[PDB]
Amino acid sequence: GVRTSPTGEKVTHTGQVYDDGDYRKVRFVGRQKEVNENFAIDLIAEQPVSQVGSRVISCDGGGGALGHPRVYINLDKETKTGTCGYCGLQFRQQ
Amino acid sequence: LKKTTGLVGLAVCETPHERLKILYTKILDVLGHIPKNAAYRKYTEQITNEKLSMVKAEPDVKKLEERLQGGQIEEVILQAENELSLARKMIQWKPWEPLVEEPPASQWKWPI
Amino acid sequence: QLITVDEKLDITTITGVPEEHIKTRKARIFVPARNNMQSGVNNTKKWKMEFDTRERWENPLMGWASTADPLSNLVLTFSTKEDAVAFAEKNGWSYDVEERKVPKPKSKSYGANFSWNKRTRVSTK
Amino acid sequence: GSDRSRFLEGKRAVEDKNIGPLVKTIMTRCIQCTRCIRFASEIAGVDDLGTTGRGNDMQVGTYIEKMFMSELSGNIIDICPVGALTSKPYAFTARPWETRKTESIDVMDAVGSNIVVSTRTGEVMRILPRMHEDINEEWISDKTR
Amino acid sequence: HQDLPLGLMDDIYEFSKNFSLRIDELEEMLTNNRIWRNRTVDIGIVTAEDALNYGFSGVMLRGSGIQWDLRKTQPYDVYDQVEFDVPIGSRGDCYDRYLCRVEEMRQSIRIISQCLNKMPPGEIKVDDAKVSPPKRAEMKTSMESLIHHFKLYTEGYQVPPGATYTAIEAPKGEFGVYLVSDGSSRPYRCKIKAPGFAHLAGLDKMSKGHMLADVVAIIGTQDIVFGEVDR
Amino acid sequence: ASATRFIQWLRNWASGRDLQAKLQLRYQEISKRTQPPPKLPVGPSHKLSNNYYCTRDGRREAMPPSIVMSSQKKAVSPAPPIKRWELSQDEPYL
Amino acid sequence: TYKYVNLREPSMDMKSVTDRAAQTLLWTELIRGLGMTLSYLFREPATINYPFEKGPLSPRFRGEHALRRYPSGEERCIACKLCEAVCPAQAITIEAEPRADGSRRTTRYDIDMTKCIYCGFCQEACPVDAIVEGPNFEFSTETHEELLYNKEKLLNNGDKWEAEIAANIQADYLYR
Amino acid sequence: RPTVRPRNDVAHKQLSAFGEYVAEILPKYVQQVQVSCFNELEICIHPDGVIPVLTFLRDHSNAQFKSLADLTAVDIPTRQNRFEIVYNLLSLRFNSRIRVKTYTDELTPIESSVPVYKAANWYEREIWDMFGVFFANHPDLRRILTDYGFEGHPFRKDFPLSGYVELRYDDEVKRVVAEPVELAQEFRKFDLNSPWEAFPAYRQPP
Amino acid sequence: LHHAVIPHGKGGRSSVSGIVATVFGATGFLGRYVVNHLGRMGSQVIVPHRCEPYDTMHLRPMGDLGQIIFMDWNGRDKDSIRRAVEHSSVVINLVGREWETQNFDFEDVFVKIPQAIAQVSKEAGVEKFIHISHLNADIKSSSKYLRSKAVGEKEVRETFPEATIIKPAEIFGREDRFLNYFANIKTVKQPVYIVDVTKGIINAIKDPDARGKTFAFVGPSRYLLFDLVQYVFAVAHRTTRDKVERIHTTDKILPHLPGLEDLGVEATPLELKAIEVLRRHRVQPAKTIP
Amino acid sequence: TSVKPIFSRDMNEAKRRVRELYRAWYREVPNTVHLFQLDISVKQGRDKVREMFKKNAHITDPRVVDLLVIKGKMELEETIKVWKQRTHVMRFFHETEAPRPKDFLSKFYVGHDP
Numbered sequence A: 001g002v003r004t005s006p007t008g009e010k011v012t013h014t015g016q017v018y019d020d021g022d023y024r025k026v027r028f029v030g031r032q033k034e035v036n037e038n039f040a041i042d043l044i045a046e047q048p049v050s051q052v053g054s055r056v057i058s059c060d061g062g063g064g065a066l067g068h069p070r071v072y073i074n075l076d077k078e079t080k081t082g083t084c085g086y087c088g089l090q091f092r093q094q
Numbered sequence B: 001l002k003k004t005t006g007l008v009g010l011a012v013c014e015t016p017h018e019r020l021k022i023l024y025t026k027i028l029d030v031l032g033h034i035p036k037n038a039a040y041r042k043y044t045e046q047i048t049n050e051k052l053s054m055v056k057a058e059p060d061v062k063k064l065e066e067r068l069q070g071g072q073i074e075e076v077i078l079q080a081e082n083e084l085s086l087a088r089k090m091i092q093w094k095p096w097e098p099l100v101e102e103p104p105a106s107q108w109k110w111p112i
Numbered sequence C: 001q002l003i004t005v006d007e008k009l010d011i012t013t014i015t016g017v018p019e020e021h022i023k024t025r026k027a028r029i030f031v032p033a034r035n036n037m038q039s040g041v042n043n044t045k046k047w048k049m050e051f052d053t054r055e056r057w058e059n060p061l062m063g064w065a066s067t068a069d070p071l072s073n074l075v076l077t078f079s080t081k082e083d084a085v086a087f088a089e090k091n092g093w094s095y096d097v098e099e100r101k102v103p104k105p106k107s108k109s110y111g112a113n114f115s116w117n118k119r120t121r122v123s124t125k
Numbered sequence D: 001g002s003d004r005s006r007f008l009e010g011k012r013a014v015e016d017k018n019i020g021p022l023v024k025t026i027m028t029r030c031i032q033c034t035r036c037i038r039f040a041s042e043i044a045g046v047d048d049l050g051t052t053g054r055g056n057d058m059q060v061g062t063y064i065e066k067m068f069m070s071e072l073s074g075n076i077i078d079i080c081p082v083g084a085l086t087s088k089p090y091a092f093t094a095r096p097w098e099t100r101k102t103e104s105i106d107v108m109d110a111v112g113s114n115i116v117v118s119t120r121t122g123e124v125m126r127i128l129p130r131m132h133e134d135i136n137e138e139w140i141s142d143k144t145r
Numbered sequence E: 001h002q003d004l005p006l007g008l009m010d011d012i013y014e015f016s017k018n019f020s021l022r023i024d025e026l027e028e029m030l031t032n033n034r035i036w037r038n039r040t041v042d043i044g045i046v047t048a049e050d051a052l053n054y055g056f057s058g059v060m061l062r063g064s065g066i067q068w069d070l071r072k073t074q075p076y077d078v079y080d081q082v083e084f085d086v087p088i089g090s091r092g093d094c095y096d097r098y099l100c101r102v103e104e105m106r107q108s109i110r111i112i113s114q115c116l117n118k119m120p121p122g123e124i125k126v127d128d129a130k131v132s133p134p135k136r137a138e139m140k141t142s143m144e145s146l147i148h149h150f151k152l153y154t155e156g157y158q159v160p161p162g163a164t165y166t167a168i169e170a171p172k173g174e175f176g177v178y179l180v181s182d183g184s185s186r187p188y189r190c191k192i193k194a195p196g197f198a199h200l201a202g203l204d205k206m207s208k209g210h211m212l213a214d215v216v217a218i219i220g221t222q223d224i225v226f227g228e229v230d231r
Numbered sequence F: 001a002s003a004t005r006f007i008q009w010l011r012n013w014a015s016g017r018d019l020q021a022k023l024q025l026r027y028q029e030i031s032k033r034t035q036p037p038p039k040l041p042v043g044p045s046h047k048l049s050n051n052y053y054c055t056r057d058g059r060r061e062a063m064p065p066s067i068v069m070s071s072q073k074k075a076v077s078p079a080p081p082i083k084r085w086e087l088s089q090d091e092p093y094l
Numbered sequence G: 001t002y003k004y005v006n007l008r009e010p011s012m013d014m015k016s017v018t019d020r021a022a023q024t025l026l027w028t029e030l031i032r033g034l035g036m037t038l039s040y041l042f043r044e045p046a047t048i049n050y051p052f053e054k055g056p057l058s059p060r061f062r063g064e065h066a067l068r069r070y071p072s073g074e075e076r077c078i079a080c081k082l083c084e085a086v087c088p089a090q091a092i093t094i095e096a097e098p099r100a101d102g103s104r105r106t107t108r109y110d111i112d113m114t115k116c117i118y119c120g121f122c123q124e125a126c127p128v129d130a131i132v133e134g135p136n137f138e139f140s141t142e143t144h145e146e147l148l149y150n151k152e153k154l155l156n157n158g159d160k161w162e163a164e165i166a167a168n169i170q171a172d173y174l175y176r
Numbered sequence H: 001r002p003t004v005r006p007r008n009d010v011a012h013k014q015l016s017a018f019g020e021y022v023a024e025i026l027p028k029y030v031q032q033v034q035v036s037c038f039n040e041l042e043i044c045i046h047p048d049g050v051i052p053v054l055t056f057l058r059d060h061s062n063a064q065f066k067s068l069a070d071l072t073a074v075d076i077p078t079r080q081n082r083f084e085i086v087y088n089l090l091s092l093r094f095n096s097r098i099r100v101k102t103y104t105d106e107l108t109p110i111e112s113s114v115p116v117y118k119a120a121n122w123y124e125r126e127i128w129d130m131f132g133v134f135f136a137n138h139p140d141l142r143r144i145l146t147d148y149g150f151e152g153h154p155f156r157k158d159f160p161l162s163g164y165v166e167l168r169y170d171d172e173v174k175r176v177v178a179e180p181v182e183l184a185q186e187f188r189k190f191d192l193n194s195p196w197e198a199f200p201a202y203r204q205p206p
Numbered sequence I: 001l002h003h004a005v006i007p008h009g010k011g012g013r014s015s016v017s018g019i020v021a022t023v024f025g026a027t028g029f030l031g032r033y034v035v036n037h038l039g040r041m042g043s044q045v046i047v048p049h050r051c052e053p054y055d056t057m058h059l060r061p062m063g064d065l066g067q068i069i070f071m072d073w074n075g076r077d078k079d080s081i082r083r084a085v086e087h088s089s090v091v092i093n094l095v096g097r098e099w100e101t102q103n104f105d106f107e108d109v110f111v112k113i114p115q116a117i118a119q120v121s122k123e124a125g126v127e128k129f130i131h132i133s134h135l136n137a138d139i140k141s142s143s144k145y146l147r148s149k150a151v152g153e154k155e156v157r158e159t160f161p162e163a164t165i166i167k168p169a170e171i172f173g174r175e176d177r178f179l180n181y182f183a184n185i186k187t188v189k190q191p192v193y194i195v196d197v198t199k200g201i202i203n204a205i206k207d208p209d210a211r212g213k214t215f216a217f218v219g220p221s222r223y224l225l226f227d228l229v230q231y232v233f234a235v236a237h238r239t240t241r242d243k244v245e246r247i248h249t250t251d252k253i254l255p256h257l258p259g260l261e262d263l264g265v266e267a268t269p270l271e272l273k274a275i276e277v278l279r280r281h282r283v284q285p286a287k288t289i290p
Numbered sequence J: 001t002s003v004k005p006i007f008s009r010d011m012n013e014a015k016r017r018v019r020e021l022y023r024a025w026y027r028e029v030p031n032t033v034h035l036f037q038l039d040i041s042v043k044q045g046r047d048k049v050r051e052m053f054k055k056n057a058h059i060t061d062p063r064v065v066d067l068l069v070i071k072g073k074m075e076l077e078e079t080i081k082v083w084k085q086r087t088h089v090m091r092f093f094h095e096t097e098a099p100r101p102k103d104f105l106s107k108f109y110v111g112h113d114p
């Protein structure tokens, strides 16, 4: 989700960008502004919702002990998905 | 006789039985100037008399060193001299007197 | 050979503290309030001495919080307010003392939950 | 408590309840202590909180979709022993160990409620009650908070 | 913190098998070298009694004939379960202390050999999760484990109030801490006892009657690192 | 390990040692840099019963110091005299 | 148990005395020392050809830090601040807020690499394997400011080194 | 029990008896004798007893504490006498250790123990440097660890962690100069103590 | 004021002075003192340099992390001037040579370069411009150095009407070409201390009245050139035609211009500092002219 | 109010040690200025010595006075034996310190500190 301000400075995934009158952008003259191009908020929105056949599902983020702490997610509400608090994966009940 | 005590700066004693008798006797002499009830006198006389008795009952130095349990006989002579020097200082300090002063109320309270 | 010294104990000249951080500081002597997020009372036992808060500003390079106050993080613990006051006086700090707040004893009765004729009767459990 | 677990089953999971813009609910953390229910009924004089269901499935909430908007509502965050009820404005911004606590006074009314101003690195992070038996006890109003 | 990676003990065996030959080569350079002996023999002599009173420890005591090693007299961990000899000097000079150090390396190899053969199975940190953190797999599945992990890495474990002086036979001599706990998770006071501190304080005494170049030998024979001296 | 026979003889003779048996350079005797995964054991407290923490709580068994005297018969030493060391039978004299 | 390192009486018979005299006058022990350095001259040296050859390291090696992701690309870091709490050098600075999608995520994650002691306590404390010390150790700079890492720098290190970092974690996680 | 440190009653009993032994012999100076649950003997004395008590422990035949392991101080501001002086002695003869503790304030000298242990020389200089405790009749009392002209005694609890001044090179005067400390990032104070009691055995009376 | 340039701190190294200064000619005698004083109080200093980066190293310790920023520039390249000043609040011109080179003469360095800097700075919207000229600047001087200084002073005043122009006498200091010049060997000179001139420039940035004015920076005492050179030799216990012509120019008396005193600076006598400058080359003070 | 003395049993005894320290510092300044090649005059050095003694002129506790003299003699020894370098001696004069504002208005303009 990299976009540039009218001055041409890249906006980071945290929304940071020096405004027009900020002297501090002089630090980038002759150099460059380090911006990571892989915005996590965009990438997690690409993952499909997982359909499960139960009211409660668990997520450990994958990879077993290489993931995150195992949490159990309630899927009773039919107007929204269950989202994992750690990794952002989404679940919905059939 | 032994060629070395093994400890740097500690010379071999030629006549250790006679040296110890002199020192243990001197110690009991200095102790007589300490009050009768003082714990230093009572305990020091007790251990000094134990040591003096072993020295009077064991002509063999190696077997006496085993009885005294204080290292080389030259180490025991050195300890006898430290006691005698200590005893003389005790006379001036008089530690057997009552506690000079009580600490403030929470001086030794831990944690705070 | 004791000597008699009737003067007040004042060690400001031999503590090495610069002048501005003696005369211009205001020490606060208090028992910290219980953290309302928890019911444990173990952090309200002792008396604390802390100094007045001074400026913090954003470092131009990183945005970190900068300070010029050498006492910004100085917190001293004391068994009694009297010990804290004594310590503040000999160091020459002007101070404020706040009386310890202790919860007043409450009258609790589980039976009152079911009163025949009083408003203490609970509507649910 | 003990230092380890011997529970080998799956865990319960509960759905969340929306009760307004001030108090976020993550009810899986609720331990059914009923403090919030008792506070709402007795201190706030609002009987909109309760328990529905039975047994291991008993749930704290409102049953219906209802906002718990009371001038004293934010106090249920303080008394909830767990992270089930939390300040929505405060969410995720700080951890307790890094906050500096400044004991101060509320000026949003004339009651003079005693407060603690939590700050970190020169920024005010939140406002907590400071216990004063003769003024605000251990509560503050939502405006103060 | 962690268990030995698989294959590590084999590589330590391979290293230890050849080390004493490396010690032998070092001795071939120094031990009988007349120039080396001229720089160390009768240099910085300290008597046994002076060594004790000046606060010396380790090789600064044993070079003078004192029979003292904390691993033998006040053993810690499993030092009472391994066999080794304590090198002892006779002249109290730089040369005997050098010989004591070379012989201690050989005895270390002798201990290392026993450690490799007698290494037991089992866990490697106390099975008490209020002190040592739980394994990561447990931290990610068990509620108790996650709470204890969270608290051990933020607050840390609380230590009952008290004070201890603890010492070991470190390579440079007696290394100790006077550690005071006030009951909380941060130490109230931690005084570090560095053996080099007392040894360097003895340089003036030991240098008496010697030449300027001997001061170089005497500082070297004390084995001074200023990280521990200044702290 | 690749020295010619003449060079091996020369350096063995000059050192007076058989250097080839204890080369200070490592070759194939060392362990592989890829190893099979471990399966580490668990400690004695990993039990499902008869394992209450109050029976194995070291910190809570720590007591305040015993006060033998506060300002509020035979002589003794702090411990028995230390026993004399024995000479090594492995190698008493270098 | 003890041994004497230097407690011997030289033999004073004529053959032994002449042996010591020969050593003194003919310098025999000194010639023996020359044999030892000569033997090393013909030994293969232990030098490796850096940077074409590298010193061996293990999967546990504590090097340059990096922030990691899940396979989906979501950040692993959830702004728990356990790393910041445990850091012996106070080298970590963190700020966080609810992200636009409601997620718990950091808005500041700085590591002052000139405060850091490369102790690895942060990667032990992290509950989700977000912060790691990677295998890189060749990142010296011409200025001090280049060693004050912010979140962007650390995420790029994660994207740069993940292939190796994932393999190293695989090799050692069963020891953790 | 594998995770619990075993007790040693024999050592505890031996140290308790020796503690009473020292107290009976030097009642003029001994105020408290205590033995820890991990068997370390502490003798608490009036400060006037430093030389006699240490001398007795060094030279007495049932003591023979020939080695001074360490000499240090602890600052406890809430005490009227804020400084605790700690002597840790070692007896090779009896393979035992003892701790002797006394106290003083900012203005009351303590007697130098240099006559009893030559090791005490630098330890007392360090205590003077880090705490400002003056030792009387010390052969050469002066700073040892801090910079020349350094003001304050840094190990006092009310001395700030980063001090009051810091150094840089100034080109105008072509020398290193000292200036009031300014930190780009202030040290971040953490409040870590749990509000729940951990150790009931140490609970203080109300 | 933009929020990033609001002053904070106690005026120290890690403070925020609010000044964002581009200092041209910062790698010379005067520049190091100016950059040092800016960095002391936590200013943002941009240093455009023509020299090797090695020759700028002595400036690096003068600021906290990030406070000194280095750039490349050419005197003849206005784009490199624009990059240096586009973010600044004050521009300080300290460019100069005491001799001419095959590539740059006195007109290039004292007229065209200052004019280019003043013009680019005005276009970029810089608020403050501080230009160093010379007390003895004069179109009628025998020195081409002083003739160019007069033309440049006029051109800068027209280009950037609000410029603060400072006209110092010969500056004495550790790296000067004045006391060192004599020590390596009819006219009245009034030399001024290096540190006083720096303090004068620094106060000129802070003082809102200094804008649009011309200052003369002179020491407190006037001496005969002969008295001075003999005093230099006594304290030390012992070139081009243009340079000699400037040394032999009597220092103008300009009562109508304000001086260091008007900027809160008290002038420093040569007698207090002569030792500091001349100790390395190694006493009756030189008589003054009342 | 009965305490152990350091050196002096009363203020009259202490003031004798103060004056002796001042004489020692007074005579040392010319050697210090020469030995360290200081750019301050001897008059400046003696003025600094006088300034440092006069900020403690109000003390009435002989034990405090003793400690100031003990410390003052340590500083003299550091200077005479040239354990100090030039930077240490010059630290008394605070040459790189910009003048701090004293009056209310100046403090009001620059920040929040009193």
Ligand SMILES: CCCCCCCCCCCCCCCCCC(=O)OC[C@H](COP(=O)(O)OCCN)OC(=O)CCCCCCCCCCCCCCCCC
Pocket: E034, G024, G025, G026, G027, G030, G031
């Ligand atoms: C038939 C009748 C005939 C009559 C004539 C008979 C005479 C023959 C018998 C006598 C032979 C005399 C030997 C001459 C060599 C000199 C001997 C000598 O001086 O060595 C002793 C010297 C000091 O020895 P030290 O043990 O330290 O103490 C003794 C003094 N108190 O120790 C030293 O000098 C040590 C050497 C210092 C240098 C070390 C560095 C190099 C050593 C290795 C060099 C290798 C040999 C060099 C050969 C060069 C060839 C050109």
Ligand SMILES: NC(=O)C1=CN([C@@H]2O[C@H](COP(=O)(O)OP(=O)(O)OC[C@H]3O[C@@H](n4cnc5c(N)ncnc54)[C@H](OP(=O)(O)O)[C@@H]3O)[C@@H](O)[C@H]2O)C=CC1
Pocket: I024, I025, I026, I027, I028, I029, I030, I031, I049, I050, I051, I074, I075, I093, I094, I095, I096, I097, I098, I104, I109, I132, I133, I134, I135, I168, I169, I170, I171, I172, I177, I178
């Ligand atoms: N010093 C004195 O006695 C007096 C000085 N002045 C004025 O003060 C200012 C500076 O004084 P001073 O510091 O002594 O001058 P210096 O010669 O000491 O340094 C001058 C600066 O100008 C830079 N410079 C010179 N030529 C060029 C060029 N062609 N292109 C780019 N940069 C260039 C140099 O950079 P580099 O290092 O790259 O050469 C250097 O940094 C000058 O304007 C001078 O006229 C006025 C009165 C008296």
Ligand code: SF4
Pocket: D029, D030, D031, D032, D033, D034, D035, D036, D037, D060, D079, D080, D081, D082, D084, D085
């Ligand atoms: S106070 Fe919290 S834990 Fe208790 S019932 Fe209410 S939501 Fe559940």
Ligand code: SF4
Pocket: D029, D081, D082, D083, D084, E147
């Ligand atoms: S912090 Fe407390 S409420 Fe939150 S998850 Fe952990 S145990 Fe539950």
Ligand code: SF4
Pocket: G083, G086, G087, G088, G089, G090, G091, G092, G111, G115, G116, G117, G118, G119, G120, G121, G122, G123, G133
């Ligand atoms: S490696 Fe250690 S010092 Fe560095 S950031 Fe991690 S915890 Fe902090």
Ligand code: SF4
Pocket: G076, G077, G078, G079, G080, G081, G082, G083, G084, G094, G125, G126, G127, G128, G129, G130, G131
């Ligand atoms: S890196 Fe890990 S430990 Fe640090 S804040 Fe993020 S999730 Fe928590």
Ligand SMILES: [K+]
Pocket: D076, D077, D078, D079, D080, D081, D082, D083, D084, D085, D086
């Ligand atoms: K809560």
Ligand SMILES: [Zn+2]
Pocket: A059, A060, A061, A068, A084, A085, A086, A087, A088, A089
């Ligand atoms: Zn997940």
